[PDB]
Design a protein around this ligand. Structure first.
Ligand SMILES: [Zn+2]
Ligand SMILES: [Zn+2]
Ligand SMILES: [Zn+2]
Lengths: 213, 96, 213
């Protein structure tokens, strides 16, 4: 099956990098910025195909959303456990992936502050449409990505522990639980990349005169 | 006991900046300038084990270049004990 | 596939139970004896159907020769080990098996000796043709069966050890070998059972008058 990508453009407003707020996470947005770093094109696990460790039958077309996930269904009835799996990288499907870093435009930086950066990720056909040093308008979705460096930051960092209310227990003997931090940074995932001119306002001549009306 | 076949004059020509999702597990012909190279290392090719329970030396097994190979049976003392790779009876290929 | 059975009968000679010697083991033979005990008809594993433990795939039509055997081939290429298997008793094939004990005929007993018994095994259609208390002529093969009671008997009991001459070993460190005793007793595997008269020389009358000439 061919993967399709929907690219939206001509959004009514264009946001600065510093205008990005947490209320717009998971929402369609258009930002602008100057590209500083471009990574090389890398494969991203889209449709993972797994084999169970002890039943050893192959299953395919597993949804992959950001962090790496393994299925717990195990549809064959031969075995009885869910957690143990092994990835088949040859059989699984991948998409193009690029992490391009963008910086606030020089006219948009506030009075005394330094420019702040943002890692926007391009997937599929949008990859390699941005060059080091040009001004690009990215249309996409404001996403959120796990950050570990917020451990030393002041303030109450949210955390997640397992709720145990409907679980029966006995004090037979022979008390451990899984608690994990909720610390994140805002990132962007663009479906449309257009390069507006770095100015204020292809070697062959034929392709140039074809472009002009 | 090993003959390597080298395919020459592959027609499709790719630059390193245009390798994509479609070229995985496929033959690509790419040009470029070598920046730096590592030393020649011995990679296991015909892997031979010994069993710590009995000392028996197991048969040679081909090492796939994709992943490490491991053995779980001894076939002499019938044990799943810890087997160790001995380098004197293991055969290697060059790696760079 | 049905299980065909070849029964031979009318041999030129019939041997006594004390005429049984070790050099006729594996040979076609006819003996006569008085049946003393008959066992319940039981199933015997004729074609075993096994499942590999970590392949979890089934294999069938496995020959079972006397003692219980497990295949080590595993034509499924998923596994790398041969010893570990499980038996599926429903899918495997069985055969009718009976063990009947026979004793010396009264005239055949020597001068001062007590009668000696032999366990003759009937398979297939020959089961339940031997009834307690009658003189019977068995035709079959002198087979051999493992015996544990010969442990304290005088004489050198033969034993088997693994021959280790072409096996390379290293004294790395961190010497056990498998030895079994080859002690055996003679039994009989009969394919044909006929009930000759317990005398020296069916209630309905029609079935009796039809038999007469
Ligand atoms: Zn499974
Ligand atoms: Zn061993
Ligand atoms: Zn197997």
């Amino acid at each position: 099956e061919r993967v399709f990508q929907i690219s939206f453009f001509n959004l009514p407003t264009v946001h600065r990098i510093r205008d990005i707020r947490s209320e717009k996470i998971g929402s369609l947005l258009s930002i602008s910025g100057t590209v500083t770093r471009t990574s090389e094109v890398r494969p991203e696990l889209y449709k993972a195909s797994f084999t169970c460790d002890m039943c050893r039958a192959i299953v395919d077309n597993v949804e992959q959303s950001f962090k790496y996930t393994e299925p717990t269904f195990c549809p064959n009835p031969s075995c009885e456990n869910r957690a143990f799996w092994t990835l088949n990288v040859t059989r699984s499907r991948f998409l193009d992936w690029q992490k391009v870093r963008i910086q606030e435009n020089a006219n948009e930086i506030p009075t005394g502050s330094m420019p702040r950066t943002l890692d926007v990720i391009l997937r599929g056909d949008s990859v390699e449409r941005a060059k080091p040093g040009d001004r690009c308008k990215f249309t996409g979705v404001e996403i959120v990505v796990p950050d570990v460096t917020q451990l030393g930051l002041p303030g109450v960092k949210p955390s997640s522990t397992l709720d145990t209310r409907g679980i029966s227990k006995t004090t037979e003997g022979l008390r451990s639980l899984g608690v994990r931090d909720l610390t994140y940074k805002i990132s962007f995932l663009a479906c449309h990349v257009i390069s507006i001119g770095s100015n204020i306002g292809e070697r062959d001549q034929e392709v140039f005169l074809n472009s002009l009306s | 006991s090993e003959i390597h076949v080298r395919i020459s004059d592959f027609p499709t020509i790719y630059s390193l900046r245009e390798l994509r999702e479609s070229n995985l597990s496929s033959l690509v012909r790419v040009t470029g300038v070598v920046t730096r190279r590592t030393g020649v290392f011995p990679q296991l090719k015909y892997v031979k084990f010994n069993c710590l329970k009995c000392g028996s030396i197991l048969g040679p097994f081909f090492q796939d270049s994709n992943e490490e190979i491991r053995i779980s049976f001894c076939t002499n003392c019938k044990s799943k004990g810890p087997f160790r790779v001995n380098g004197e009876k293991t055969v290697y290929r060059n790696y760079q």
